[PDB]
Amino acid sequence: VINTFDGVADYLQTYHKLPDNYITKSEAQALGWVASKGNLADVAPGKSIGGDIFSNREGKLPGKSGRTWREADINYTSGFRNSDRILYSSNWLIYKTTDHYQTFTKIR
């Protein structure tokens, strides 16, 4: 249920954590998620990938010492993962990408 840009953004800034429907890539994989098969919804009903650290090696997102960036899939329900991601920092800055991390815009 909580997988939209606004629902997830507002949850991160309030709860300071991703909702219960998010699991990391490693947790998904251990449950049987095979990216090439687009089977996430089959092996982890109702879950989206999220919570993994985003390197930000391209300097597109703002930097700062001790700042860690994390991503979460947005708008996912079934099949292959889409291209919508929410990016959130340790101090709860919220960015969006809809083009597979090519470009970001601030949303909070």
Curated annotation (Swiss-Prot):
It is found in: Secreted. Keywords: Endonuclease, Genetically modified food, Hydrolase, Nuclease, Secreted, Signal. Its EC number is 3.1.27.-. The keyword Secreted applies. Introduced by genetic manipulation and expressed in male sterile maize and rape by Plant Genetic Systems and in radicchio rosso by Bejo Zaden. Barnase expressed in transgenic plants will specifically destroy the tissue(s) where it is expressed. After cell transformation, protein expression and plant regeneration, the active nuclease destroys the pollen producing organs thus rendering the plant sterile. One of its GO terms (cellular component) is extracellular region. It is an enzyme of class 3 (hydrolase). Its main location: secreted. The keyword Nuclease applies. Hydrolyzes phosphodiester bonds in RNA, poly- and oligoribonucleotides resulting in 3'-nucleoside monophosphates via 2',3'-cyclophosphate intermediates. This is Ribonuclease. It comes from Bacillus amyloliquefaciens (Bacillus velezensis). The chain holds residues 50 to 157 of 157 of the full protein.
